[PDB]
Every structure is written in structure tokens, then in C-alpha cells.
Design a protein around this ligand. Structure first.
Ligand SMILES: Nc1ncnc2c1ncn2[C@@H]1O[C@H](COP(=O)(O)OP(=O)(O)OP(=O)(O)O)[C@@H](O)[C@H]1O
Ligand SMILES: Nc1ncnc2c1ncn2[C@@H]1O[C@H](COP(=O)(O)OP(=O)(O)OP(=O)(O)O)[C@@H](O)[C@H]1O
Ligand SMILES: Cc1cn([C@H]2C[C@H](O)[C@@H](COP(=O)(O)OP(=O)(O)OP(=O)(O)O)O2)c(=O)[nH]c1=O
Ligand SMILES: [Mg+2]
Ligand SMILES: [Mg+2]
Ligand SMILES: [Mn+2]
Ligand SMILES: [Mn+2]
Ligand SMILES: [Mn+2]
Ligand SMILES: [Mn+2]
Lengths: 683, 289, 289, 683
């Protein structure tokens, strides 16, 4: 066993009844003085390194050609001047195993952390040396972390796409289904997770040109997509991951759910395609009143009204659907469907739950389209227009397929540096650059939506780490007050940066004029309610930083009205799974699953303590499963009120609790304004 | 939660000895050295003898004490495979490769062999100790059964898989691979039945059952090391066989819901080439806060 | 002189209910009267109970006490067929034709039906009375098993055969014919084992064993008459079924090496109407013509 | 039990030790007196019938509008003047259950046999009343039978395409694979059987964008295609049928074959995807000499030579591939592979066998392309060019995808009417019309090849029926003499009609000038070898008909040289599954499987004796399984020497014969010039 492995395992060997957390630090030293420094490839100077990486097809030469070598040297020197040290063994291990650039045979390390950060910063700046240094300082301080696609692939010749998630709308036609399968394979080839809205597809037993009971429903398309994602599995490196979203009022909703039952037959079971359910407020109202609900056949509704079932408001059209004899429907028990959802989530963690009305009551771009589904991580909530892929030799009507670039603020590092504004603006600029340089040649709706919406996702990580390292319980009202203030600041500065980009470029996102940003409605709660901290401890935490007031929000509203906004969507809180290790941060705004996690790598086992875990903050690092899910819902709703897109909200459940407890948590989330629920992980 | 699924997997894996023609093995058998032929014969007899105990006692005794019609049916199916399919398959392999007198002598030798007998009698002892309506004694026997299915067979399976991965004795190697695939599912299934009993116990009783399982594993493992050297030193393979035993011991433990005992090791590439939460109705007022 | 040929016959008869698609019976089932459907469900439920106990208890226990690995392999295979194939097939039929509540009700009905409980009590009692190394207790259980295989099933088999012969419920009927084909060979085989034990006895002992067999048959027969009337009076067939069970009682006696006990009668002619490839290598001469 | 069914089951009841065959005739009468006439919709006049069928969207207005009502009435009167009577119950049952037009509620019969024949004739003639009457006389004499798609769908508004055999070339790219899946779905939606060539696809473990061990091979593509064919199943009417062809020198050939093994796992086996193997002469030579063969990685060959492995002649390329270090290959035993093919055919009848050199040594259009694969029925053998389907908003390079037009001559009816020439020419005209009226808007290469090649398949059926009713054993040399003469006349008149159409329209098929028809090579064996019958009995059979001599063939060769040929391909012998029942004929040129076949429809049993079966010809109606497969191969080769495309050739084996016998039959077929082997049906 390696020396650093033994040093890391020495953490759990208690001394005087206490964990040896400091041993972890020793491990990193070993991991660098025995493996990383020996396995790294050193050159005489930076010029030889850059030339070797360029000619050997490791780096794209275009982004490096925008800078003179003196500027690149200055950027690299700025990166190395911080003398960044990984405080935990797992941070360095995760970076050098998942994100550091290696040779073709993967026998040596070509990229250090500073080298990777410098390359990403130079790609972000697009020829601006000062901007590149700003990005270097932002990432080496670990205030901002680009998503895994962006951080791993920026400036690389053998790179994939920098966009993490893609959302596709599938129209009810064989041509559209085949095009959706093709685009899903193309985007999984690019490495991104693909989500498909199957609510427009007509249910099982519908007519294909006057011959009835002909359609296979959404389950056949689900099987096709599952095989497509199995085939396109990132060249066999990462399993192809897809998501299917169906409205709960679709007739196939049961069969949909039956794809995830552990007793499902092979002709129905789907195993590589995640499932999500979109629940309008009408379904929750029907379940609450115990009135029997009706699921609908989408094609009959489309024939009668000319629009898809998910294209209009069910809260106002459900009674018209039910009373219409030309609309076909089936009777269901909404409470039984809710119990089935809870049982499925207990068994397998599926489906994702999207509360459609919670998303669309604060959605700023309802004029473009209502949000009808979410992404594979159930945090992207954007307007999408379905595409009409016609026959060959016929022009296709290209719609809008959602796609946003992810980037997370490290809350602990951002607040320690007292740089919410600067970090938010620089992250917005980096995400705007990632969107601008993204061009996908096989997904036309994705390309058009990227060019028009200009949507980005700016997330946050290390919420629980910051709260526990500052002596604040994650479930406490003080923690929710901090989240309210911090994310109001993040939203304020993201809107300010979006408006500044719109002013400097003279262009807004497409159809911005009909948005609530243009009409000023979006700023209502910000121009009437003060989001400054209500607790003295939180206010002290925010000292040295100008917390925006109602007057600052009014000025920002006027600025947006004058100049517009460059981005249709700005903030989305992704799960941030593996890149949180490198940043020494807790995953996303979720509470920690465990204080010390035991992970098996190779034939060895390693223990990763939570960042900053110690004796004095052991009980502030409360495990998520031990927490009240209602207070976690309260925290997520408090954050969500300042996030325009959704938050990947994983439910952390105990084995003792029943499906009724899961249903109660889901209904409280819906009541509190939670937009989406990601996972039901049971301990 | 699992018996109907295992029923399906078991019955769809049904096969018969006659399906594989064995005679073409003589074209590679004739080219093996005396030590290779000797080891193969001894390993084969070891597997045969252990599998007979499982068919005559192990599976039928567990089927007798387990409650549930569907479980009894699956267990009956597994017992059938031992007696009607596996036993005939081993006999067929022997009759193809050795003359009658050689078969009788190998079985005489392996029947007297100290390391084969030690493990065979240890397992049989636990089957004989099951008491009516005593789930603790049943669990102990299930542990023994899982150890046989998922662990003890593998010091033996190594050699046919080693040849099979090299292009030698392909017909008998195909048969062995089918047998092994059955024993794998048998081990997993009996493992789930043992975990069901284990989970019904107190914390102190659980700790006591864990100690039993680890102690038993240790006794069997130390004898396997001796068994291994006794058979494989003459063909220079013992080091690699030992890695394969530990890897399969870990699988057996995982079948019983226990943590792996041994560190992870890589396996010989030639052998590799051969190889519900409680539903509670919504009571209303759960929609109001 | 016979086990090997029974082994081969049993394994070549292997089948699963899923091989037969049952949705074709949906309409002829829908068309039967409520009385007819009730009798049909109950008849198959009575059969399910018999096969449940034959698979769980009867065949495994006889296998335990009979000497010889090949004899045990045949008996183990027959046991598997009883509970893993036969008993399960009835559920396939039930799940196709009947709603869950009707299925639940018929299984509740078997538990409380006095004739079905009596026949199970009597047969299983004899199985559980077998004493190790006591050939007489074993003979008695084998007689009971032959009576189950070759006599007791037939009050149940009558009705699926009666429909099959009229071109009704033919998919379910195909399953039943496969079950019947199996039981016929099971009854012969167990009969031959019983005769082996009987033939070892003194003339005085033989006389007592015949008394046992005939007394048991009469006791089972009298109970079966009441069971038959209870099921078939509502469909008007009790007298016809009674003739059929007497016919089959004689076959059971014959399987035991005894003379027929009931006089011959005309059976309903409808019911009578209700009744890998070898591989060679390619030679160099096969490429030229 | 209905009266006609009792009269049909009375056949098996033997009177005086003989089957009551004549009772079948009575059954037909009952089937018309009790059922057909009662459930046939009658109208006061044909005008009312046509108006009702057109208005209720049963027929098409376009093809009926080309004639005055007087001409349509005259065509219908010509059809009804024959007073055609079905000679067997199964003929009428199959027509009125499969082909007769029924109401939307499927309880009444709108079309009789004469009505359907008249409608198909009017569709064929395209406005010519005399041509329509000629077609009516052709089909009511039952001399020619349009295929099931053409016969069922001609003149019907609610219909699929008239072509049901489609051959697709799949290029080695994700875009091309997705396009192939889409086209397969679209063509299965149209009701056609789709065959895909997977030899150009790179094998498992190949590089994608210079990353190693990334390709899933052709098995993942087969899984995708199998899912696509399961999804597209003719609106839930028939099971989606597809075929995949792989060259035997493709490395995936074993895994390909492993998709049909019973022991294959669920992630390996494809259930609704037929498989065929293309066997070049090089593989047969390697197996014959027992030399170990090499299966090649297609992408390495493409990188080294710039052409696909299946696009070059393996006979001259195999040694260069083996000796090339940059071509990756795996060692195999060709005799073991042949034994595996025989074993798989014994178990399941798969794969289809295509002898590439047997096809291409007589292929007339090798300049366009060599025949690389066959159809789902393994009788279509045409040149195909792969298409380069690029990314979106990029022009695709459309190639040639085979789609031939099926139609079968009834040899008994054709020869008893002494009308080989007239029937062949009229069938060629009808096939040309159906090919010209086919327009598929979702298969670009299929449409392009239909427009360019103008390929049709004119088959024959009732060969064994005709031979048995004339006292000729199917295995006798007289039967082969008759087949030789009859199919040489069929080829002569097909070529003459193609040249006449080319002269009339002034156009040939694309790239005809490079064909062997243009160079006169095709006619070589016809201008030197006389194909007149060598037996007096066969000559008396051909009495009253002019048999083309060598001088006639020289004149035809000169005519083709002067005027060209309209069709790239003319003759292909399809299995003719259900149309053989309606025509009261034996299926294809195959020998009969059973003298009397027992079928189960609903809960009733039915008995179909072979046409013309009696006590006198009971011995001549020998069953196919009892026949010597070598003599069946000899007859099929005798026919194949006059057929430009292939013949659906099913092997009929007994359970006693082993895989050595199957391999011997396959090797004798290869030796005798058999192009394709369809199925290995074991009795
Ligand atoms: N935790 C760590 N994170 C990142 N790099 C590390 C870490 N520990 C060691 N290294 C690398 O290994 C080298 C070993 O030097 P070490 O940290 O022991 O101190 P040093 O030799 O006094 O110099 P310095 O600390 O100034 O780099 C470091 O210079 C650095 O490049
Ligand atoms: N074998 C058959 N094939 C086809 N149609 C038949 C057959 N037998 C009877 N029919 C149909 O039933 C009708 C009655 O025919 P039948 O044998 O009674 O005498 P017919 O002289 O042909 O009668 P019609 O006055 O109808 O012409 C036929 O006209 C035809 O439409
Ligand atoms: C072709 C086909 C379609 N479908 C379903 C899936 C699609 O969502 C739906 C629409 O198919 P379409 O491609 O729209 O078929 P269509 O346009 O010819 O019919 P229509 O005019 O009614 O739109 O039909 C199947 O389920 N199976 C099939 O094989
Ligand atoms: Mg449509
Ligand atoms: Mg390519
Ligand atoms: Mn075994
Ligand atoms: Mn076993
Ligand atoms: Mn039984
Ligand atoms: Mn039995």
C-alpha cells in the first residue's frame, strides 16, 4: 500500500478518542512527494511545455495564439504565485485522476492544478491578459469553479463539449422521435447528459393516421432512447446517461413509472434512462381533495385544440379536457399515483419531481414558453419550444432546446474573500464565454437556443461547509437567513453583470422584451422586501461587503429596463458531484451525506473528511440523513426564491420512515415553492 | 422481494450434458504433461465429491427447513441441477478423459485426501446440525452452503478455466463454465435467505453470527491454502490460485451481506479470459401545513 | 433395469408453462356459465394443492430414503416438476383467466374445504411417517404417492380434458395434458419402487401390505366421491367423473402390481378425445464435388 | 364449427383409402354460400360502389380519374366474365382474410377477387383501358400475381408502400448509423422489410477520433436496429421485420453470429433482426485448404487504403490485408466458422448465406458496385452505393439503396396458356409502373436508386405444382431441363421488354453503358449455348410456344446494344408467402414442404392440400424434406443461371442430418453457383 494511503487511513485510527484529521494533510504531502512530483513531466521552461502540448494535439493552438508568450508566462506565474496547496489528500487525488491532463498512454502527468487553472483562464479571457489574471486569481483562490466539462476540457484539442446538460423537446412524430434519438446519441458522444420531454408524444393505444390502438406510447420511445444512450456511452468511458420527463397527466404516466419498478419485465424495464415526472398544481389539488383525476391522451387533445397537452395550462384547461367528449382520458387516483411516486423513489430514487406551477409562477420567460421539464440533474428550468423535424428534402422548423453552461461559486471562499460581486461577475463572464464558443453542429435546436437564449447556469457549492465552519447549524434559521442574503447578493450581481454585458454588446437575449425582466415584474419582491440578514451573526459574516438594499435593487431594475439582460437564465445550482472534491467543498447547497466518507479506489480504501471537519465543528457537520427534511426544504426554498432556474434537491431519507413520510416531504416542498426534487437517497 | 426473479433466472439457465460434445477434448488432453493431467483429474474429483454432498444433502436440507412455497420450488430446482445435470456432467467429463480403472483410483485417492475431506466434512457437519424450527442453525448451514457455492469450488474451477482461457480442453471447459454459472446464482440466492434470518436477529446475536461466519471462513481458508499447494505446486500455479480463492471468498461474504475480508487483488488474465419502504397511505391533512 | 430410461424420459419431457400462450382461451372462458367457471377454478386449485405437497414434501422425502444416485436424480427431477413447473402452471392459468379477488377466494377455499384437507392430511401424514432404514414405512408412503399421482389428480383432470375434447380452453388444456403426461410416468416409476419393497416380504407380510393398500384406496375413494359431488353437481357431471376416477384407481393399483378393483365402465368419449443438432467436423473431401 | 370448415376437415377422412380432395371444392362453395356472399357489400351498380369507396377514403381518386366510367365498367366486366372460382377453400379464405378490402369495422367485404383484380389492373394501366383489360385478363387467368404489397395496396388510399424489400447501406459514422435507424423506422412504417449492410461499420474495439477500444462494434448497431424494428411494427399490425448483413471477414462476425445463439444474453441477442452472412470465395478457399483465416478490423483497412473492406475484392486484397502491419486482424479457423454457421442454421435457420463471388461473377452492374449484401428474403442482389449522411445544415452525399419491385409468374397458369412472352412483358410493364409510382420521402438513397436503377423483381411460383401435375419429379433431370428452358424464355422476354421500354421512353437505367448488357457480355452464354429442352417431354410441354434460339438471342443482344435496357435488374424469385394460396400455387420455385398442410385459425382447424394434389400425382408431390438437397441445389442453380438477381432458396433438412450435411449442402450450393441460401428449416 502507498505511504499516502496509509497516512489517509490513519485518520480513522483514533488518538485520545479523537480522529487524526491532521494526518490527512500529511497524506497530501506524501501524495505529492512520492507520486505527483515523480509522475509529473517537467520542461526547461513554459515555452517548451506549451509547444509540446500544442504539437502533440493536447492543446488547441487558437486560444493560446491570442496571447503573446510573455502574457501566458505572466498568467502562469500569477497562478503559481499563490502557492496553492491541497488541504486534503482526496482533493489532489480527484484532480490528478479526473481533471489533470495526462499523456496519451496515461503514464505521466502533464498538467498541474496551476497549469489547468491557467489554461482555463486563458481560454476564458479570449485574448485579455488582465482578464486571464483575474480568472487565475478567482480559480486559484477557489472562489469559482467551472463545471467538470469546462474545467476538464477547456483549451484541449481532444476535448468534448463544455456544456454539461442538454434538454430536448420531442414532437409527436416518427421523424421527430428519430431525430431526438440521433441528437441524444450525438450529445452523449459529446459527453453531455441529455434530457428529453416525452409529454408531447401520444400515449399507448392512440391512432397513427386513422388506424387506432397503434402507438407504442412513451415506453417504446423510452426503450429506443435507452438503447441510444447505451450505444453512445462516451466511447465506453462513462456510461451514457439520459433522462426522460413525462407530465403526470399523460396517460402513460403509470407505464412510464413502471419502467423503474424493480419487478418490471425486460420489454418494459429501462435501466440507463433516468425518469422525471412533471406535476402541475392541478394534480396536487386533486390529490389533496381526494377527487379522482384523469390522465389524458395527448393526440386527442392536440386534434381538438390544435395545441399539445403540455403546451397549455392544466390548471385552467383540465376541466375543459374532462368535459370534452372528443378528448380521450382514463380515470386515476391521484393519491394512489402520489403513493406510487413515493414507493418508486424509496425503491430506486426515481422519478425526478418537477412542480410545474412552482417553476412557472416565478419563471421570467413564460412568454417564450412555459418550463415543461427539467434536465438530468433536475436543476435546469428554462423555456423550450418544440422543433418540427419534417421529412427528408423538407425544411425543418427548428425550435429551442435548452442548454446551459454550469459554474459554481465556492461559498466559503467567496465569503472569506468578501468578493461576492467580483466572483459573480467574473463567473458570469466566463459562462458567457463558454456559451459563445459553444457550437454544436448536430443539434440544431440546441444551437439555436444557445445563440438566442444565451442561458448560463451559475451555481454554488460549500454552503454546508461554510455554515459548519462558522458554527451555524444547517437547519437553523440563521443558516436560512445567510442563504437568503447570500443568494440575493448573487442574484443581484448576476443580473447586474447580465445587464452590463447587454449594454456593452448592445444585444439582449431573444424575446427579452416580453420577459418579466423587461416589464420590471421580476424585481417586485426585490424592490419591496429587504433581504439583509435578520441575525447579528449573519450580518457580521457579511461585514466588509455592501449588501444590496431596495434602493440598489430599484437602480438595478432601472438599469435593466434601460439596457436589458444578456442572459435569459443565469443561476442554476447543479449537484457538483466530483469537482467539489478538488475545491475542498461540500457538494452543492445540499447538506453533507456523511462526515467522513469511505471510498474504495483500486484495491485500496480512502477516507475523505468533510472540509474543515474537526472536534469543535463535528456536530455542526450534521449528516443529511439525520436532518429534518422539512428544514432542508425550507433552506432550499429560501435559496430558490433567488435562483431563476432550479436547484438539484436530493432528499435524504432514513430506512425507518415510510412512503407517507416521503409524500409529506414532497407535498411540503411543493407548498414551500420547491421547483424540482432530484433524488430520494435512503440510508 | 426476490424469489420470483431468481426463479426466472434459474429456469432460463436450464441445460443438459448431452448439448456439449466432449470427444474433441482428446485432441488437447493428449498433449498435457503427467502433472497437468494428474492435477486436472484430482481437481475434477474434488469438485465432483463436493457437488454430490450439495445435491444429496445441502440443497434438499435447506429446502426442507425454509418456509415459503415459492422458495421451496426454487430450492428444488437448484437441487435438481446438482443431481440431474451437474453430477452427470462431471461423470461425462471423467469417462471421456480417463479409462474406468484410472477414474476409480483418482476417486480412491481424493476420497482419502486430508484437505478435501477436512472441508467436505466441515460443510456436511453444519448441514447435519440443522434443528427443526431453529433459524440460527439454519443460518449457519446457509453460510456453509454459500461458502461451498461461492468460495470452496473455486480452488477447483481455477484449473479448467485456466485451460479454457488458453484454448485447451474447450468442451469440458464449456461444461465447467455452465456449472460455475449455476453455482454463482445458487450462492447469491442462499445468501439472500441467510441475510433474511440475520436481519431478524438482535444486535448482540448479529455480532455473534458475524463472528461465526468469519471464524468458519478462516478455518476453510487456511485449509484451502494447504489444499492449493498440495495440488498446484507441481504445475507452478499456487500463487495465482491463492489470489483467486481470496477474490471468491470476498464474493461469498458479499452474498451474505458482509464486508470483504481480503484486500482487492488482480486475477490471472488467462483465467479471466476463461471466466421496499413501508407503504403507508396518505391520511389527508398531509396536504396542509 | 429401468431408472436410466426413466431419467432420459423425464429430462426429455422438460417444459415450462410460459412456452404456451394462454390469451387464446380468453373468449371460451368468458363464454362459460358461472357454475362452470367456479368448478373449473376449484378443480385446478385442488390440483395445485396436491402438487404443492408432492413437490414440497412427497418427492423430496422419498428421494431421501431411496438408495442410489441415479434413482435420487430421477426423484429429485420429479420433485422439481411438481412445485417449480406443475403447481406454478396453475397460477399462470389463474392469472390469465381470473381477476385477483377470484384467485384470492379460491385459495382461501382450498384451506377450508374439508375433503381437500382430509386428503392432504392422509397423504402427507404417510410421507412424514417414513422412518430411516424402515422399508415398510417407505412402501406405505410410495403407495400414497402412487394414489396421488395416478388416482387423486383425476377428479381434477376430468374437467380440463372434458373442455379440451370439445375444443374449449385448449391452451389451458395443453398445459394440463403436459402435466398429465408427467404424472403418468411419475406413477409408474414410484409404482416400480414400491413393488421392489413389496417383493422382499414374506407371503404373510405381503397379505398385510395388500390390506393396507386396499384399505387406503377405499378410504381415499370414499372421500373423493364426496369431493367430486361437491364440485361437479352444479355442472351436472358427478356420475361421469366418478366413473373416470374408478378407471384411474385401477391404473394406480396396476402401477403397484395389483389386480383392478373396480368393474370397467364407459367413460365420456369427450374426455377420451381430450387425451441443438449433432455436429460433425468438415473433412477435406466435403469441399470437392 | 362452420359448415365450410367441416367440409374442409372432411379431406383427411379417408374414403376407400383415399383422401377426399374433391370435398375441398365443396367447402369453397359453402365458404361462398354461407359466409362470403352474406358478408359482401353489394351496390345497385358499379358507379355507386366506386363512389362509396372513393368517398369513404377506401380508394384513390387519381388512378380512377384517368378513366371514364365506361372504361372502368368495361374492365370490371372483363374481370367478371372469366367467372373465376377458387379451386380450394384456403385460396378464397386467404384472399378474403388478407387481401379483400373490408370496411373500417372489419365486418363486411367491399372487394371481391374480381373487384381487387380490376382495381389493380386500372392502377397498372395508368389510363389505358385496353392495357387495363390486358392486366385483368392476366390476373384473372392467374398467370401473373403482383406481390402482397402491390396486390393489397394498389388503388387504396389507406395503404402502405407498394415496395416491401429495402436494402440500406450504413456508413461507418454515428450520423450514418442514426440515419439508418431513422430510415429503417420509416420504411417499416410503410410496411416494408428492411435489410441493412453492416460490413462498413468498424468492429468492436476500434478507435473513434483516435481514442482506442471505443467502438461497440456492429452488435450495438444491431441492438439499435432491433429496437427500431420492434418500435416500427406497421402501426401494431405485424411484427417489425429487419435483416442485418455482415461480411464473413468482418471481425464482429462471431459476435454477429452470437446474436442468434440461444445461450446469448439479453444484451447480446437480437430477436426481431434477421442476420445474413456474406461469404466471399476467399473464405471458402481458406476453409477448403484448412488454412487459418483472418477477420479484419474495417476501420484500419479504411484508414490504410481509403476504401471500405467490403468495397474491394477480398480475393485480391486478402493477402495484402494480412501482410499489411497497419491493418489489424484476428486469427480464426474458417472451418470452425463454417461449422458454427451450420450449427446456428440448424438451431434457428440463421444466418442467410450470400456467396459474394457467385453473385458478382454474373452481376451485370459491377461497374456501379458489386453486390455486397441481400434483402430480408435473401433474393434481391443489386449494386448499392453507400451514402455519406453528414451533420445537420450540411449537404449529404446520397448513394444508392436497393428497393426492387416484386411480382411472380404462375408457371402452371403461364405455361398452360402458352403465354410466357405476353405474361412476362405485361408483368414487366406493371412492375415498371409500380416502380415509377413509388416515391419515398424519408429514404433519400432508396428514392434515388429507384429513380436511377429502375430495378424490378419478376419472380416465378408454382414450379413444383406445375411439375407434379405434369408427372415430373422435382429432382428429376427433366424438371431441371424444364426450369432451364422456362427461365431462359423468361429472361429473354424480360430483357426484350426492358429494351422495348428503353426504346419507347428513350432512356435506360443510370450507368447502363458500363453494364454487361451494353458491352454484350451478358448475352455471351446465350449466343453460344442453346437452351432448348433436351427431353421430348419438356419439348412437348413447350409446344405451341416459340423457344428463343441462339439467333434470337443474338438479335436481342443487338437490340439491347442499339436501344439499351430500361431496368438495371428484372428478375428475382421471392418466397411468395401468402399470394401462393390465393393463386392456388406452390410457394416460389421451392419444393412443397407438406402435401397437405394443417393450420389453426382462431379455434378452428383447416386443411390445405397442395394444388392439383390427387392419388395419381401424390408421388410426384414429394415433400421437400424427403428430397435430396443436392438435386434441389441443382435445380435452383439451373434457374439461377437465368435470373440476374438471387432466388430465395430455403434448405429443407431432416432432424437426423448433422451440421456436416448442412455444410456440405452449403458448399455444393457455392460450387454450383447458388447466389443466396435463405433458410435451414428442420423437420
Ligand atoms: N498539499 C500540496 N498541494 C499541492 N502541491 C503540493 C502539496 N504538497 C506538496 N506539493 C508540491 O510538492 C512540493 C514539495 O515541497 P514542499 O511543499 O514539501 O515544501 P518546500 O520544498 O519547502 O517548498 P514550497 O512549499 O515552497 O513549494 C511543493 O513545492 C509543491 O510543488
Ligand atoms: N368456388 C367459388 N369461387 C368463387 N366464388 C364462388 C365459388 N362458389 C360460389 N361462388 C360465388 O357464389 C355465387 C354462386 O355460385 P353457384 O355455384 O351457386 O352458381 P353460379 O351459376 O356460378 O351462380 P351465379 O348466378 O351467382 O353466377 C357465384 O356467382 C360466386 O359469386
Ligand atoms: C410510425 C409509428 C408511430 N408511432 C407513434 C409515435 C409518434 O409519436 C406518433 C406519430 O407518428 P407520425 O410520424 O406523426 O405518423 P403520421 O404523421 O403518419 O400519423 P399522424 O398523421 O396521425 O401524425 O405515432 C408508433 O408508436 N409506432 C410507429 O411505428
Ligand atoms: Mg404526425
Ligand atoms: Mg467518421
Ligand atoms: Mn453443482
Ligand atoms: Mn450449487
Ligand atoms: Mn404434478
Ligand atoms: Mn407427479
Amino acid at each position: 500500500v502507498p505511504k499516502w494511503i496509509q497516512l489517509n487511513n490513519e485518520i480513522m485510527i483514533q488518538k485520545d478518542g479523537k480522529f487524526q484529521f491532521d494526518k490527512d494533510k500529511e497524506a497530501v504531502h506524501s501524495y505529492f512527494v512520492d507520486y505527483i512530483n515523480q509522475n509529473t513531466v517537467f520542461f526547461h521552461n513554459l515555452k517548451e511545455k506549451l509547444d509540446y502540448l500544442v504539437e502533440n494535439q493536447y492543446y488547441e493552438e487558437e486560444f493560446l495564439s491570442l496571447y503573446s508568450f510573455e502574457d501566458i508566462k505572466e498568467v502562469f506565474k500569477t497562478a503559481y504565485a499563490k502557492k496553492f496547496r491541497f488541504p486534503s489528500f482526496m482533493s489532489a487525488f480527484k484532480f490528478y485522476n479526473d481533471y489533470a491532463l495526462k499523456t496519451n498512454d496515461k503514464k505521466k502527468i502533464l498538467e498541474r492544478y496551476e497549469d489547468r487553472i491557467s489554461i482555463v483562464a486563458l481560454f476564458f479571457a479570449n485574448g485579455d491578459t488582465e482578464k486571464a489574471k483575474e480568472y487565475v486569481n478567482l480559480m486559484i483562490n477557489q472562489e469559482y469553479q467551472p463545471s467538470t466539462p469546462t474545467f476538464l476540457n477547456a483549451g484541449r484539442k481532444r476535448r468534448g463539449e463544455l456544456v454539461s446538460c442538454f434538454l430536448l423537446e420531442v414532437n409527436d412524430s416518427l421523424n421527430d422521435i428519430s431525430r431526438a434519438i440521433d441528437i441524444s446519441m450525438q450529445l452523449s458522444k459529446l459527453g453531455g447528459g441529455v434530457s428529453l420531454n416525452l409529454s408531447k408524444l401520444r400515449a399507448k393505444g392512440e391512432a397513427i393516421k386513422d388506424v387506432e390502438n397503434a402507438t407504442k406510447g412513451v415506453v417504446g420511445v423510452m426503450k429506443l432512447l435507452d438503447n441510444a444512450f447505451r450505444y453512445a456511452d462516451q466511447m465506453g468511458q462513462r456510461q451514457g446517461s439520459g433522462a426522460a420527463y413525462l407530465n403526470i397527466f399523460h396517460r402513460d404516466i403509470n407505464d412510464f413509472l413502471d419502467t423503474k419498478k424493480i419487478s418490471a419485465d425486460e420489454d418494459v424495464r429501462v435501466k440507463t434512462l433516468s425518469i422525471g415526472v412533471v406535476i402541475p398544481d392541478k394534480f396536487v389539488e386533486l390529490a389533496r381533495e381526494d377527487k379522482a383525476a384523469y390522465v389524458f391522451y395527448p393526440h386527442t387533445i392536440y386534434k381538438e385544440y390544435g395545441q399539445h397537452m403540455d403546451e397549455m395550462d392544466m390548471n385552467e384547461m383540465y376541466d375543459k379536457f374532462v368535459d370534452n367528449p372528443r378528448v380521450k382520458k382514463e380515470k386515476i387516483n391521484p393519491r394512489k399515483l402520489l403513493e406510487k411516486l413515493a414507493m418508486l423513489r424509496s425503491e430506486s430514487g426515481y422519478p425526478y419531481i418537477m412542480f410545474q406551477d412552482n417553476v412557472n409562477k416565478v419563471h421570467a420567460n413564460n412568454h417564450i414558453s412555459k418550463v415543461k421539464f427539467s434536465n438530468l440533474c433536475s436543476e435546469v428550468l428554462q423555456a423550450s419550444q418544440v422543433s418540427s423535424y419534417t421529412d427528408y428534402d423538407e425544411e425543418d422548423e427548428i425550435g429551442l432546446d435548452i442548454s446551459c453552461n454550469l459554474g459554481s461559486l465556492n461559498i466559503l471562499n467567496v465569503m472569506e474573500h468578501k468578493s461576492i460581486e467580483k466572483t459573480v461577475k467574473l463567473a458570469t463572464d466566463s459562462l458567457t464565454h463558454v456559451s459563445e464558443t459553444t457550437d454544436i453542429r448536430n443539434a440544431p435546436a440546441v444551437r439555436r437556443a444557445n445563440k438566442a437564449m444565451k442561458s448560463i447556469g451559475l451555481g454554488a457549492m460549500n454552503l454546508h461547509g461554510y455554515l459548519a465552519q462558522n458554527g451555524i447549524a444547517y437547519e437553523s434559521p440563521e443558516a436560512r437567513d445567510f442563504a437568503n442574503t447570500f443568494f440575493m447578493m448573487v442574484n443581484f450581481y448576476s443580473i447586474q453583470r447580465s445587464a452590463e454585458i447587454a449594454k456593452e454588446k448592445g444585444e439582449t437575449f431573444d424575446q427579452y422584451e416580453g420577459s418579466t425582466y423587461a416589464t420590471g415584474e421580476y424585481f417586485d419582491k426585490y424592490v419591496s422586501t429587504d433581504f439583509s440578514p435578520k441575525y447579528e451573526k449573519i450580518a457580521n459574516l457579511f461585514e466588509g461587503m455592501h449588501i444590496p438594499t431596495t434602493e440598489d435593487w430599484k437602480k438595478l431594475k432601472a438599469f435593466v429596463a434601460e439596457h436589458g439582460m444578456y442572459h435569459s437564465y443565469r443561476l442554476c445550482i447543479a449537484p457538483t458531484g466530483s469537482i467539489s472534491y478538488v475545491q475542498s467543498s461540500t457538494a452543492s447547497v445540499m447538506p453533507i451525506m456523511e462526515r467522513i466518507e469511505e471510498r474504495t479506489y483500486g484495491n485500496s480504501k480512502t477516507y475523505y473528511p468533510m472540509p474543515g471537519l474537526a472536534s469543535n465543528n463535528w456536530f455542526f457537520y450534521k449528516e443529511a440523513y439525520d436532518m429534518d427534511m422539512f428544514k432542508v426544504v425550507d433552506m432550499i426554498a429560501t435559496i430558490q426564491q433567488h435562483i431563476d432556474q432550479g436547484i438539484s434537491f436530493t432528499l435524504f431519507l432514513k430506512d425507518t420512515m415510510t412512503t407517507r413520510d416521503l409524500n409529506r416531504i414532497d407535498l411540503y416542498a411543493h407548498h414551500r415553492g420547491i421547483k424540482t426534487i432530484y433524488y430520494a437517497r435512503t440510508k | 422481494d426476490f424469489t420470483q426473479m431468481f426463479y426466472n433466472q434459474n429456469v432460463k439457465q436450464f441445460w443438459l450434458p448431452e448439448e456439449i460434445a466432449l470427444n474433441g477434448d482428446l485432441l488437447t488432453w493428449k498433449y498435457l504433461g503427467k502433472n497437468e493431467q494428474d492435477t486436472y483429474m484430482k481437481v475434477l474429483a474434488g469438485l465432483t465429491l463436493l457437488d454430490t454432498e450439495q445435491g444429496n444433502t445441502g440443497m434438499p436440507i435447506v429446502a426442507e427447513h425454509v418456509d415459503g412455497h415459492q422458495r421451496k420450488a426454487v430450492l428444488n430446482f437448484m437441487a435438481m441441477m446438482e443431481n440431474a445435470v451437474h453430477a452427470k456432467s462431471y461423470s461425462n467429463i471423467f469417462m471421456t478423459l480417463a479409462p474406468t480403472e484410472t477414474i476409480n483410483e483418482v476417486f480412491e485417492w481424493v476420497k482419502q485426501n486430508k484437505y478435501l475431506q477436512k472441508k467436505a466434512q466441515m460443510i456436511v457437519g453444519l448441514y447435519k446440525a440443522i434443528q427443526k424450527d431453529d433459524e440460527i442453525s439454519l443460518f449457519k448451514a446457509m453460510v456453509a452452503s454459500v461458502y461451498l457455492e461461492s468460495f470452496l469450488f473455486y480452488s477447483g474451477f481455477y484449473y479448467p478455466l485456466y485451460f479454457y482461457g488458453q484454448g485447451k480442453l474447450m468442451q469440458s471447459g464449456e461444461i465447467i463454465n455452465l456449472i460455475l454459472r449455476d453455482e454463482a446464482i445458487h450462492g447469491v440466492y442462499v445468501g439472500l435467505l441467510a441475510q433474511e434470518i440475520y436481519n431478524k436477529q438482535t444486535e448482540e446475536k448479529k455480532a455473534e453470527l458475524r463472528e461465526f461466519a468469519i471464524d468458519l471462513l478462516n478455518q476453510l481458508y487456511e485449509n484451502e491454502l494447504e489444499y492449493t499447494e498440495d495440488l498446484y505446486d507441481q504445475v507452478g500455479l499456487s500463487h495465482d490460485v491463492k489470489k483467486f480463492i481470496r477474490y471468491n471468498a470476498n464474493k461469498a461474504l458479499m452474498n451474505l451481506g458482509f464486508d470483504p475480508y481480503f484486500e482487492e487483488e488482480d486475477i490471472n488474465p488467462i483465467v479471466l479470459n476463461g471466466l421496499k419502504a413501508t407503504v403507508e397511505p396518505l391520511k389527508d391533512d398531509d396536504f396542509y401545513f
